[PDB]
Amino acid sequence: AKSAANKLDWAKVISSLRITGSTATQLSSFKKRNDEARRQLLELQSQPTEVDFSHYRSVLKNTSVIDKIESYVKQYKPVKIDASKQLQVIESFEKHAMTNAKETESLVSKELKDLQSTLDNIQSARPFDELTVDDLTKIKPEIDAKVEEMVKKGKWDVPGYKDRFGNLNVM
């Protein structure tokens, strides 16, 4: 009932742990719980829609309100209607939400499978034995670019080389 809505909400809270930083989506959800509970407390608070026109009207002997307010209550059974044009325009907002949701969904789905392919590609091609440094130059001309820039610079020390391939020095 109300619990279906709220179970999906709180599931979304522990999902929202993974995507936290929507600070008024969560306030809106807290509100949706609030106002859902407000209508729930309203509808559970709900008195009868009329007087006990049988007993408690036959209680009052005097006749000036017992026909009057009975007929007035039965008159005012018209008590006006609910909005339902708000579920069209809020539904427009839901459409926008859905559009964006699907775009995001599709984007991350593509990326997920891209990452699967990428992992396999790193697995099926990536030396770990020998491999010519020329092949590394061929696959990364970044190698030669930095080298040429260093040769041009008059540098022959790469900074960090020593920090993970310590110098052999006997001095």
């Binding site: 959800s29 106002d35 407000r38 209508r39 709900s46 008195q47 829609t49 609910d82 809020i90 839901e94």
Partner: peptide, 25 residues
Amino acid sequence: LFDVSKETVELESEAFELKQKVELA
């Protein structure tokens, strides 16, 4: 969750019409 949230709000609207019946009684 979007759907669920808008749905609850709709229900509160209907509750007002009820409320005036409740009240009047």
